[PDB]
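Wed. Picked up where I left off yesterday with Protein phosphatase methylesterase 1. The coffee machine is broken again, so keeping this brief.
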Amino acid sequence: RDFSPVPWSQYFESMEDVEVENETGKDTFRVYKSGSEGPVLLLLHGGGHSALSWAVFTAAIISRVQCRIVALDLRSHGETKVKNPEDLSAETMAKDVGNVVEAMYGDLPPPIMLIGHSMGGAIAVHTASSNLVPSLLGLCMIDVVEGTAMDALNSMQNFLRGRPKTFKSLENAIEWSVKSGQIRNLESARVSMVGQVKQCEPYTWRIELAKTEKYWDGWFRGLSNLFLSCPIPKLLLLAGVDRLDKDLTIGQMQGKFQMQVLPQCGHAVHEDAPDKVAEAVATFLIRHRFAEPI
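Structure written out below (tokens, as returned):
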């Protein structure tokens, strides 16, 4: 099989480094974009990943509904450069998302649907909840359930600590990511892995997720009810997570959010089964008349 790196340009129409001047100075956030019409799907990746994890999903969703895509490298991930990379509190990260949207569109933002996986799902909710994105019309969390969130992350640490510490080349990192079982979908791995690593000082991991543990409580505490309280249509996609917690079960009985079950994936279902995620998102968008089918 071919494990050579595939660039972002095979999936996104453009990319930009968005400048943001915040309390700690002047930061730059990397975004990969696509499309010209329809709602902007603002995609937030999970811990240790990057916006490139949404590459294959982007091609899949664009072929189903008329929409735009803005995949964001969160603080300390991918190619984003902040002055205080240690601060991964929910508060700061949500603020970043709002600041990025503000810088990208100013006073005339397009309709936006937040979509986040794991850590990104929590950040998506904190952002929507704090009303940091004025034009928000919908919210989606992928495999994020407060009740078991901490346990999901802890089960991962064992794997994370055992991974190779460096790779001779980007191609070897990609080959390892597939053969290790981390990324089942070869297509996604060839493009997304470049976002998970960086050149040493050979490649090494962009971030040691274990160092962010002090912020996990802030990411998930009260997240389920926080999600339910957001005054916009909502979507919960389950893949690796097999159950709702008590809060969401109650919310579901109250009809507060749409829910869909996708094929199991211990990692990122948006990388492993891009079109299944796109199909679910497209259905939701069409259901609420947020976008037109292609």
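Quick read: Strands lie at 14-22, 25-34, 40-44, 68-72, 112-117, 136-142, 197-199, 203-205, 234-238, 258-261.
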